[PDB]
Design a protein around this ligand. Structure first.
Ligand SMILES: [Ca+2]
Length: 146
């Protein structure tokens, strides 16, 4: 009855320099939004202190309209996506948001200890391990320990 996330996994290897997959944010409710009001989080544990980097090679909403950051710590750590003011109508969707998370020094992740990693999902499906927040509330998904 509100926005939700679909996910698929591209890089399925435990050990990799790039976490890689796609998101799709679908507005299933009756209210149009601006994406500027929506926060997405993909939870993963960082194995290194090198700078973490987000890269989106394609999305229909334009990659320049994404505002990536990293937050939390330990088992609460995540990639966060925020957005510029891009309207997302009721019934609409972003379409694919490709994502890669890598280190500036090209260090290897261990994905096996990442809460949001699911290598068995190769086609988009509604996915509760990536969260959305809006208006200070959790509106989609379950965060770690949540
Ligand atoms: Ca990890």
């Amino acid at each position: 009855m509100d926005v939700k996330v679909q996910y698929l996994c591209e890089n399925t290897q435990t050990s990799t320099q790039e976490i890689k997959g796609k998101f799709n944010i679908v507005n299933t409710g009756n209210r149009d939004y601006s994406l500027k009001d929506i926060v997405l989080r993909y939870y993963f544990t960082k194995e290194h202190n090198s700078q973490l980097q987000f890269i989106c090679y394609y999305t229909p909403i334009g990659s320049g309209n994404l505002i990536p950051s990293f937050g939390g710590s330990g088992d609460e750590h995540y990639l966060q996506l925020e957005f510029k003011d891009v309207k997302l109508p009721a019934g609409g969707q972003t379409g694919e948001i490709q994502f890669v998370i890598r280190y500036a020094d090209w260090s290897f992740h261990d994905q096996s200890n990442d809460y949001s990693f699911d290598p068995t999902i190769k086609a988009f499906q509604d996915y509760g391990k990536v969260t959305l927040y809006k208006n200070g509330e959790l509106v989609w998904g379950t965060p770690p320990g949540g």
